[PDB]
Structures are given as C-alpha cells and as structure tokens.
C-alpha cells in the first residue's frame, strides 16, 4: 500500500478479516480492535504466528446464515502464555434475531499460576447485551489467601464491576451454568446491559465498558503475564486448565456449531479447534 | 421435674438459655429453634455434649447493651462432624446463625445459615452448603453436591420475590468461599408484616430443605464408600482452618471489644478461637 504493507504481508492479511468485525457496531468493533492490538503489540516478542489453516480462521454457513472468525497465537517455547484467542461469531437465523459474539481470552500455561484473561460481548436478543470481563483464577482462592490478595485485592479489580453496575442500564448476569459461576473470580464483571436504545448502549460501551476492559487487560499484561512452579502444582494446573477450556467450548462446538454452520463446516473445523484449544 | 431433667442438669439448663432467642422476631426464633433442634435431634448419636465453659456459652456487655449466646457440639471420634455451632448476637444488630463444619475424614460440604439484621429496611440471609473442594478441579464434586441436589432452586425461587435482592459481600473471601448455588440475599423489610411473611413462608422452608440435603446427602455416609487418603486430609485441614479463621477473626478481634467491652471480651475470645480450632 501507499501507507504500509497490510495488504502485502501475509500475517497481517490473515488477521485482516478477523479484525474487520463486520457484524458489530463501530464502538464494538473499535473496542475489540484496540484490545486485540494491545495484546499482540505488547506480546509480539513471545507470540508465535497464527498457524490455523485459512479454512479454520474463517468459515461460514454456505446458506449465508452463519459466519465466524478465529485468531489464535500460541506462546513461544519460553512464554508464560499458552495461547491468546480472538473470536467473532455471527448467526442470524430464526425469526430474525441475530446472534453476535466478540471475545478475547488469554490462557496461561503451567509454568506460571497467574490468572487468565477474558472479555466476551454477547448479543443474542435485542433488549440485552452481556459483558463477561474477568481475570479468572487458577488457584483455589480459600486455600491461597495470598493469591486472592495479590491478584484481586491489590489490583482493585472489583472497582470496575462496582463502577459499571451503578449505571441504571446494567444489571448482574447470572449464568445458568454452575461451572461458569465457579470458574470466574469473585471480581468478575458478569453483566447484562440494556440494548434497545442504540445511542445509549453505544455511549455505555465507549465511555464505560471500554475503559474498564482496557484497564483489566492492563493488569493482566502487567501483573499476570509480566519463583518457579513445581511438578506437583504443574499437573494440578494442567488438569484445571484442561477442564476449564473443554467445558467452555464443548457444548458450543458439539451442539451449537452443527446447527449454525451446517454439518460439513462443523466437521471440518470442530476437531481443528479442539486441537488448537488443547482438549 | 416430673417429666424431665432440664431444670436439674447444668448443660441442659444453659442450652435452653440459648434456645430462648430473646431479641428476635417470633418467626425468626421458630426458624432457629426448628433448625437447631433438627440438627441435634437427627445427629444426637454422633454429637458430644457441649464441652465448653458456662461463661463462654452465654455472655453480655456488663453495661447490658450487647448479648450473645453460643451452642457448640463436637462430633464424636468416628463422626464426620467437626463441630456444630448455633449462635445469637444482639447488640441495632441481630445475628442468628447455625453453621455445620465437617472434618477431614469426609470431604463433603459444610452448612451455613445466617440471618444478619444490621439496619432496618433490610435483612441479610446467607444460606449455603459451602464447598470443600475446588469446583473446577473436581467437577464430580460439583455434580454430586450442587447439580444432583438442585440446591440452586432455593436461590432462584426466593429471588423471584420483589422484596428479595441479591447480596454481594464486601469480602472477596466470602464471595470465593460460598458455593455457586449459595443464597446470598438481601430482603427489604418494607414493613415487619411482609418481612415476617417471607421468613415464615419462604426462608424457613428453604433453610429446612437445605439442612435436609446436608444431613442426608453430605453428613450421611454412602455405602461401601471410600476413605480420605494420604493427606488430601492435609489439604482439607488447611482449607477448613482458613475458612473458620476468616469466618470469625475480624469479628473476634475488633467487634467483640467494640461491643461487649474489654475484659468480658478478653475472658471470651480466646475460648472461642480455641473452640473454633483456629
Ligand atoms: Na443497574
Ligand atoms: Na427479586
């Protein structure tokens, strides 16, 4: 290009579609762009290139009802990072209620025991947007009062949830899944945001959700990603990490995907994603 | 007396002093009485007599502003039960509660019900079977004790009520230590009559049903079922100790002098920690 090499360099271009975030608002794709850019800019020296086949990075329902994009960058041999994953999912089928999901998860390996990172924006309905924003814990918080103190007390993580909840439009979200409730830290922002007034929703996303998410990511990068872990704790951590991932993707990959993308697309991608997700 | 020993036995005497629940609503006293008596009546054969000093079991600010009473029964040698602890604190401030704490011979959930009144226009209920194993690392623990038991239905039901809102603790320790199905609820006392209604007709059956799941599904031994080995017991003992310690330590170190005085406090808080095994 005149101003650069995005449309020339293959790596940059493989994520161009991912970063397009076609099916969401300006404010929503802007948050996600900024978040994914920080992740990759900040961790570029320890992240392997995306090796997902083009076939798995972008896929769709041939009937045009559903479209997804996935961007995964594994950590290098010496990284505390296992992998980071950006995703978006679009499904507009039934009477016309279009499901939209944008998310970024960061997952640490055994060599550290520090918290993971998660943001998810999910709009299935039209009266509601769900925000999941957390640094989920990788150690039992009652057995380890010190872990709780340095990752959740010292870090003022709960200020972000208390802040967002003050808004009249923002109620607590309660997962029907007990695993979800257990897997997320006591400072997790699990929130429902009223969605039926685009101009106000947009204002809440840009003035409130965005600073909050950027600051949470800021502590993940600064206090979690930036003593050794012994072999007994390593196996504990790996058993725990594998449950959390499996359980987090299983029903979606196995039940939701064949519906959304037809069977042919599911059969092509589902295994490859479980592969990529270590499960 | 002609049909009993309660006016004649010392331990039976100052166990009734507890059961009086003097500073609380008539329906609150009944809940506590039914619950505390259900625990001791179903677990009679496993529970040791209250082995605890008399001036520990009951006390008061000598200036008469505070009043507290504690009933504590240790499990016997072969019991899964560590101790059970019913209590009331008046000082306004009305706390009634019944905690069940299991030991390391079993990994099964504990039991807690607290009713904390620290402002009118509200009542805090905490009703849980607190987990004793990490729920993500032990999904089968999550299943047996929370999913299979339908414990969440109590939380969901109560919360339908327009007077009943969720309660989010200031402590991140209590958020982590209570199960995903825990009823952490704020009930708004618009007026005593509506509050009473909720207590009698909603809280009471929920607490009883949760207790029933405890007794029958948590403390009741399974058939040829296994022993807690090597020392997952070491894990269990460390988790329990910290849980019990954070359950009382700031109350015992700051609220107790603040409330009862200084020497009554001094005479009482050590015996507590000891009784609580922290
Ligand atoms: Na609100
Ligand atoms: Na309610």
Curated annotation (Swiss-Prot), chain A:
Consequence of substituting residue 106 to V: In acd2-12E13; spontaneous spreading cell death lesions
Main localization of the protein described in the UniProt heading: plastid
Catalytic reaction(s) noted: primary fluorescent chlorophyll catabolite + 2 oxidized [2Fe-2S]-[ferredoxin] = red chlorophyll catabolite + 2 reduced [2Fe-2S]-[ferredoxin] + 3 H(+)
One cellular component (GO) term of this entry: chloroplast envelope
Segments traversing the membrane: none
Known EC number: 1.3.7.12
The organism's place on the tree of life at top rank: Eukaryota
Tissue specificity field: Expressed in all tissues tested, including roots.
Swiss-Prot/TrEMBL site (Important for stereospecificity of the product) positions: 184
UniProt function note: Catalyzes the key reaction of chlorophyll catabolism, porphyrin macrocycle cleavage of pheophorbide a (pheide a) to a primary fluorescent catabolite (pFCC). Works in a two-step reaction with pheophorbide a oxygenase (PaO) by reducing the C20/C1 double bond of the intermediate, RCC. Belongs to the chlorophyll catabolic enzymes (CCEs).
Name used for this protein in its record: Red chlorophyll catabolite reductase, chloroplastic
Organism from which the protein derives: Arabidopsis thaliana
UniProtKB/Swiss-Prot annotation, chain B:
Transmembrane segments: none
Gene Ontology terms, MF aspect: red chlorophyll catabolite reductase activity
Site feature location: Important for stereospecificity of the product: 178
Protein name: Red chlorophyll catabolite reductase, chloroplastic
Enzyme class (EC, first level): oxidoreductase
Binding site for red chlorophyll catabolite: 114, 167-169, 251
Main location: plastid
Extra facts: The absence of light completely suppresses cell death in acd2 mutants.
Tissue: Expressed in all tissues tested, including roots.
Gene: RCCR
Record-level GO BP terms: chlorophyll catabolic process; defense response to other organism; regulation of plant-type hypersensitive response; regulation of programmed cell death
UniProt pathway annotation: Porphyrin-containing compound metabolism; chlorophyll degradation
Oligomeric form and interacting partners: Homodimer. Interacts with HCAR. Interacts with SGR1, NYC1, NOL, PPH, PAO and the LHCII complex. Part of a SGR1-CCE-LHCII complex, which acts in chlorophyll breakdown.
Functional description taken from the UniProt entry: Catalyzes the key reaction of chlorophyll catabolism, porphyrin macrocycle cleavage of pheophorbide a (pheide a) to a primary fluorescent catabolite (pFCC). Works in a two-step reaction with pheophorbide a oxygenase (PaO) by reducing the C20/C1 double bond of the intermediate, RCC. Belongs to the chlorophyll catabolic enzymes (CCEs).
């Amino acid at each position: 290009g005149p101003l650069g090499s995005s449309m020339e360099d293959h790596d940059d271009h493989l994520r161009r579609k991912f970063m397009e975030f076609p099916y969401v608002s300006p404010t929503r794709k802007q948050l996600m762009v900024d978040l994914m850019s920080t992740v990759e800019n900040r961790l570029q020296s320890q992240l392997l290139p995306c090796n997902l086949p083009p076939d798995v990075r972008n896929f769709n329902n041939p009937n045009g009802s559903a479209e997804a994009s996935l961007h995964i960058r594994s950590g290098d041999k010496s990284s505390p990072i296992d992998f980071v994953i950006g995703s978006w999912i679009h499904c507009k089928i039934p009477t016309g209620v279009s499901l939209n999901i944008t998310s970024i998860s960061g997952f640490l390996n055994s060599s550290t025991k520090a918290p993971n990172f998660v943001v998810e924006l999910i709009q299935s309905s039209s009266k509601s947007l769900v925000l999941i924003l957390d640094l989920p814990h990788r150690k039992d918080l009652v057995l380890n009062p010190d872990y709780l103190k340095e990752y959740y007390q010292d870090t003022a993580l709960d200020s972000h949830r208390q802040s967002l909840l003050k808004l009249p439009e923002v109620n607590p979200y309660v997962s029907p899944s007990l695993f979800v409730r257990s897997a997320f830290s006591p400072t997790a922002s699990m929130l429902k945001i009223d969605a039926e007034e685009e101009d106000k929703l947009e204002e809440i996303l840009r003035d409130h959700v965005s600073p909050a998410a950027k600051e949470v990511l800021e502590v993940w990068l600064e206090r979690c990603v930036k003593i050794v872990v012994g072999e007994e704790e390593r196996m504990e951590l790996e058993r725990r990490d594998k449950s959390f991932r499996r359980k987090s993707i299983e029903d979606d990959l196995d039940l939701q995907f064949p519906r959304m993308f037809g069977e042919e697309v599911s059969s092509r991608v589902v295994h490859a994603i479980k592969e990529a997700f270590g499960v």
